[PDB]
RNA sequence: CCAUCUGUGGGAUUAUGACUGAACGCCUCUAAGUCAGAAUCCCGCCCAGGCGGAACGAUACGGCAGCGCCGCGGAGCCUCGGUUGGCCUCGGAUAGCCGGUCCCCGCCGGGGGUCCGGUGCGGAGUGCCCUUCGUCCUGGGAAACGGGGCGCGGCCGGAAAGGCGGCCGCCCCCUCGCCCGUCACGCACCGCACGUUCGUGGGGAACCUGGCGCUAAACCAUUCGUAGACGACCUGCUUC
RNA sequence: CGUCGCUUUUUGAUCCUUCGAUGUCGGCUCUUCCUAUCAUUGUGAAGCAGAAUUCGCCAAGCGUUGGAUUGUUCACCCACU
RNA sequence: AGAACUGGCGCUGCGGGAUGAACCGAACGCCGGGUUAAGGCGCCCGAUGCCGACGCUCAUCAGACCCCAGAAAAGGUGUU
């Protein structure tokens, strides 16, 4: 059906690689918490590159042309643009598919999301080189809702750790519960073949 | 941190390549990536390997520097390695990693027809437990 | 009862980088992800499922609105191990993305 | 190079002791406790030995440019069991032309409000660093002693002084005001 | 190329879309952002412009070539007759910004309220709000009203105050009441809603807002004079007399190669009726309107105490093209946005 | 500007100046790490609001229909795509995880010893539904919650895009709601494809069919002139 | 004394395109961009005491005029700045 | 601008060089299967989704594949 996939600690274009693809085939991808999107390079050389982005402007009116988005959802959906032949029907239909949630929406909050160990800065990078955030190089440019994004995390962390709490709650019974010696048969079964 | 090492006498699981699952015991290191490494028992005969082929455990062992295959088949046989990498709980993952690829199809219908009785046993049984702390609270 | 079909997209066709050859497609069937491990599906017998307007069928079931375009797995293709295929027509150019139908006739296991 | 470890050891007094969370260095001395995290420098920070408490930073695999910096570690780890037991006492003297630097200290050592500085009528709030304190010097003229527990906060805020009174548009060979850094000492002397 | 002789741009680029604004009413833009700390009080505020005088004051401003010499300055007056609050509106706050989240209207509402809601008051059957003044009867639905307030009271965070103006109390022919929508920037979200469900239709005058001589914004729509040209609108020059088949026109209105006209060069269009804010406008004074028993009638507005007089702020002879003011008034300092008889919002 | 009025602040930083501090036993603004920093750049304020989204109001009987919701069968017409679902920790990477007495949080959990497991088995290379062909005779293990659901009724739960999630108590009903054995029966359509599921899908129009309901607005014409090239906009028309 | 480049705002060399026509000097009007910055902001250096200056750094946000003779571009001059 | 030896465009497409007269492959009846050439194999885009090998490299103006599309002297206790 739908592949969630979480956005912390990811590169930004060794995801959108894998996800321009993943998109071409029929799938839905639905990024979520990409506000928290590692990439490349130190701060400063990031956001001169989409500083000297910004200027990237039509003379005649900008109203028309280049449509710079700001917000670090609408970042990652640009990049995803280019690279799909988003020309064609075959790629307009490639959008369809997507929608990099910025933040995590109620309709996906209770989903289990999912990570892609080929775009992790925990496996890529080298540990002596520096990272920037798409978190605070894009408040940094003109997206003004860095404090209200923050502010809903808490609450869902908040309502997340009584949940791994509770969970966890229901988990110490079927271990001690498990406990019993009358159900003794049914372990031969899979003892022998692969508990 | 850092628990185990690297070491002239070090038993290592070999990950992949042509080798894989045998154990090696590392003799002596050249440079920087690759080893020096052999096993008597079990079938892998002295060579280099990389260090990101292999996979350490916890079985050091006691050798000289760099010596001949007939004083490592001594300390091999004498720790009892085959025993002791046997009956840990990490030779009997792989090999009921394993055990599950050889399952035949008449040995799942085994297992489905079974595994749901068990989990129906545990549940009428964990609900047991989900009434017993309720009524530690009822007032 | 029970789906007897391994699962597969259509991919795309045979193609060079200008030009595509329309008279085999390509797939990517679900499961396999090196061409070290495909050759189960080496002559399997593929189908294209879709839905059209009056009704065609072929069993003793009264027709209804589903027809399809048969096909077979020819050979293997890239290191990823994706699966090209020769239908007994050419596919729509529709169907990309959408899933085909790789049966378990031809079993040779 | 590519060297396979380097690595200098540090000695803990017994006044003091030092627990880790990992990369954390929790410091609990006499006279205040402090803490410094270092998730940036990836090396491993061992304190090992019952009644002696050596700890032992070891960087494996750095390259000249990783293995400069497992100093830097056990650098600052003994200005922090220097600065937990003794801490850092820092004097300033305001070198004053024919106008004379005027000072004074508001709110508990946190806020130097300085005036009369070159002629000017402008007086120049330079509050400080979170932790640390000043004093006005008894039984020395026109000095200002600073106190604190981390160096960092000391020296940083220290510098605030000298730095915000800059003689601008001038000659710098001539016209020498400012109070600057004159004395780097500690708060326990012979400790 | 290379002008020889340089110039600044002739209007500016940031009033740049110059459009028949789509609302005739002030739409505040951005309201002042609160602290919890100050009491509970409002921001912005209706009023209508009826005219102009000018003054003599008995200026203080030691520095100058002015202190204490009588100063005139020209003033203007803008009419502010009581609101009354009617809807409490309740946002939450995104990632996408601001949300209404629900609203509560008032149990019954009056005559002009109802005349926003049609295009037509005289073919329509004047059924707006018939069958919502029976949710607050009912205790059925009053449970579920208080409901939507608990619930505000739980999650919204910045809500607001629908009020409009009494328009029986003003020599207009307009009669439609210029519903607004206002911000409370009180204390807490307690304290914030828990002042205006006391008071929803009841009155709000101007001198429990504002203070006088406090300095505030103006927001209104421009005085609209038509379809205008060049030399008229950006102010370019006109060309000397010998031009052929035009003189009151830009004349080179771009380079070759930029095969395309800019938006910056300067062309003709639609003068006036734009929307603006003007900002730092003091108020003068808070005038009280035609006040109750003892006398048969006092006016007893625009009577200073070094005059001494039975005046009132009616022009002799009444207001030019406003009528007769008998109500409460604001005297700003200056100019300010529009025509007479146009609806031009003040705010805090 | 030939008279008058108004024009406003924040953030990361450039250059530069420093701090601690190695590389290099000393020195160092830098290599890791920190600080000040501006007509710059970004944003506020201001102007326009999108093949973008909210909130609320009103919803067409008269002499006649009609139009909504909830429970309704029955057929026609079009669009096609899918063959089971995971209902959620946070984050760490020179480490993190589980189980745990004690002190600190309005009688439960934030903080430390202590005990496990670790190429992760309290393992989405896994996990649970599950491949349940139906049904009967007929035995054993497992089973005191019965489970379909027009239910009937209460409750509180989840605002970032809530379009859902439980509990408790009663109700036409069942004690065959699992696993292993005993007894055979059902289209066994005679080798053969478009099988099985989402699904009493989604969209629009009629006829016989049950209840609860509702009985209005837009635009023209007229008028206004706060507006006007025309359009548009601003407004008015009560039997006082 | 040398020596190494850059820029196409000078002139020249070349003839690629346009000869069934690209309307060719200047000025006026007007917008935008360049930085190799005259003034301004933040700094550094001086054979910088102050004041007045000069050379460097980030920098195109902002300004860079009125006039006599000339068809003038350029010039030169008065004068504010 | 002008010559010498050979080849090519001119008359010529096709795979490649992102696009291109001449460059590297290769020269054409209409097509089914197979394999390669110069080229390439994160995504546009067929193919590295190989558990590729050994190093070098931090750029506040990175670099990135003949002809071919923007550079030198001199200098660096950057670093090997």
Redesign the interface.
């Given at each position: 059906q739908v592949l969630v996939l979480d956005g912390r600690g990811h590169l930004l274009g060794r995801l959108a690689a894998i996800v321009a693809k993943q998109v071409l085939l029929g799938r839905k991808v639905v990024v979520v918490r990409c506000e928290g999107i590692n990439i490349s390079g130190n701060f400063y050389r990031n956001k001169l590159k989409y500083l000297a982005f910004l200027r990237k402007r039509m003379n005649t009116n900008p109203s028309r042309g280049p449509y710079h988005f700001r917000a670090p959802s609408r970042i990652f959906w640009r990049t995803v643009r280019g690279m799909l032949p988003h020309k064609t029907k075959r790629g307009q239909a490639a959008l369809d598919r997507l929608k990099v949630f910025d933040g995590i929406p109620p309709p996906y909050d209770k989903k289990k999301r999912m990570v892609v160990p080929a775009a992790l800065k925990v496996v890529r990078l080298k540990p002596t080189r520096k990272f920037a955030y798409l978190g605070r190089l894009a408040h940094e440019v003109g997206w003004k809702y860095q404090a209200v994004t923050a502010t809903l995390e808490e609450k869902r962390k908040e309502k997340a750790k009584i949940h791994y709490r509770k969970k966890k709650q229901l988990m110490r019974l079927r271990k001690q519960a498990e406990k019993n010696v009358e159900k003794k048969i049914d372990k031969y079964t899979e003892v022998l073949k692969t508990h | 941190?850092?628990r185990r090492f690297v070491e002239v006498g070090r038993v290592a699981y070999v990950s992949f390549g042509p080798h894989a699952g045998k154990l090696v015991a590392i003799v002596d290191v050249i440079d920087?990536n690759r080893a020096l490494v052999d096993g008597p028992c079990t079938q892998v005969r002295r060579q280099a390997m990389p260090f990101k082929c292999m996979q350490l455990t916890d079985f050091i062992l006691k050798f000289p520097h760099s010596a001949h295959q007939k004083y490592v088949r001594q300390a091999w046989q004498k720790a009892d390695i085959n025993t002791k990498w046997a009956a840990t709980r990490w030779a009997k993952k792989i090999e009921?990693?394993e055990?599950?690829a050889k399952?035949t199809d008449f040995?799942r219908f085994?297992?489905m027809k079974?595994?749901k009785?068990?989990n129906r046993?545990?549940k009428n049984?964990?609900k047991?437990?989900?009434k017993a702390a309720l009524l530690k609270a009822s007032p | 009862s029970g789906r007897l079909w391994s699962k597969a997209i259509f991919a795309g066709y045979k193609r060079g980088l200008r030009n595509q050859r329309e008279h085999t497609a390509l797939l990517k069937i679900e499961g396999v992800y090196a061409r070290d491990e495909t050759e189960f599906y080496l002559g399997k017998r593929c189908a294209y499922v879709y839905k059209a307007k009056n009704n065609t069928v072929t069993p003793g079931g009264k027709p209804n609105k589903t027809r399809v375009i048969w096909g077979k797995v020819t050979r293997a293709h890239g290191n990823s191990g994706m699966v090209r295929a020769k239908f007994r027509s050419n596919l729509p150019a529709k169907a990309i993305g959408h899933r085909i139908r790789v049966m378990l006739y031809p079993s040779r296991i | 190079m590519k060297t396979i470890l380097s690595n200098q050891t540090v000695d803990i007094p017994e006044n003091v002791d030092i627990t880790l969370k990992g990369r954390t260095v929790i410091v609990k001395g006499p006279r205040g406790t402090l803490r410094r995290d270092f998730n940036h420098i990836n090396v491993e920070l061992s304190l090992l030995g019952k009644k002696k408490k050596r700890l032992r930073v070891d960087k494996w695999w750095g390259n000249r440019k990783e293995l400069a910096t497992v100093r830097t570690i056990c650098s600052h780890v003994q200005n922090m069991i220097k600065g937990v037991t003794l801490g850092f006492r820092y004097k300033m003297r305001s070198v004053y032309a024919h106008f004379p630097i005027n000072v004074v200290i508001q709110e508990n050592g946190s806020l130097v409000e300085i005036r009369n500085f070159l002629g000017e009528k402008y007086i120049r709030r330079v509050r400080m660093r979170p932790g640390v304190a000043c004093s006005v010097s008894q039984a020395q003229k026109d000095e200002l002693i600073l106190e604190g527990n981390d160096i960092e906060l000391v020296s940083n805020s220290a510098a605030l002084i000298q730095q915000a009174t800059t003689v601008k548009n001038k000659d710098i060979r001539k016209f020498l005001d400012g109070i600057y850094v004159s004395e780097k000492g500690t708060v326990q002397q012979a400790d | 190329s290379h002008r020889k002789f340089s110039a600044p741009r002739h209007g500016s680029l940031g009033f740049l879309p110059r459009k028949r604004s789509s609302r005739h009413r002030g739409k505040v833009k951005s309201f002042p952002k609160d602290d919890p700390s100050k009491p509970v009080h409002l921001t912005a505020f209706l009023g209508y412009k009826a005219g102009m005088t000018h003054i003599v004051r008995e200026v203080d401003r030691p520095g100058s070539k002015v202190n204490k010499k009588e100063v005139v300055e020209a003033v203007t007056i803008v009419e502010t007759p009581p609101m009354v609050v009617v809807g409490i509106v309740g946002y939450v706050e995104t990632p996408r910004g601001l949300r209404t989240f629900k609203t509560v209207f008032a149990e019954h509402i009056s005559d002009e309220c109802k005349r926003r809601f049609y295009k037509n008051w005289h073919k329509s059957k004047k059924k707006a709000f018939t069958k919502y003044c029976k949710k607050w009867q009912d205790e059925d639905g009053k449970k579920q009203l208080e409901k939507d307030f608990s619930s505000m009271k739980k999650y919204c965070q910045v809500i607001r105050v629908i009020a409009h103006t009494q328009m029986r109390l003003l020599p207009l022919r307009q009669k439609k009441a210029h519903l607004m929508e206002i911000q409370v920037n009180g204390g807490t979200v307690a304290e914030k809603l828990d002042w205006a469900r006391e008071r929803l239709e009841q009155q709000v005058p101007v001198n429990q807002v504002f203070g006088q001589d406090e300095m505030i914004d103006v927001i209104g729509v421009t005085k609209g004079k038509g379809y205008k040209g060049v030399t008229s609108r950006w102010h370019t020059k006109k060309l000397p007399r010998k031009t052929h088949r035009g003189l009151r026109k830009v004349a080179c209105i771009g380079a070759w190669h930029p095969a395309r006209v800019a938006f910056s060069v300067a062309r003709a269009g639609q003068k006036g009726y734009h929307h603006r804010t003007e900002i730092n406008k003091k108020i003068y004074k808070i005038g009280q309107g035609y006040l109750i028993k003892d006398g048969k009638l006092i006016k007893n507005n625009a009577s200073t105490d070094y005059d001494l007089s039975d005046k009132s702020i009616n022009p002799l002879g009444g207001f030019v093209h406003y009528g007769e003011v008998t109500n409460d008034f604001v005297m700003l300092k200056g100019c300010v946005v529009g025509t007479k008889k146009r609806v031009l919002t003040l705010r805090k």
């Open positions: - | 941190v850092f920087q009921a990693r055990r599950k399952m040995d085994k297992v079974a595994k009785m068990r046993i545990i049984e964990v047991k437990l989900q | - | - | -």
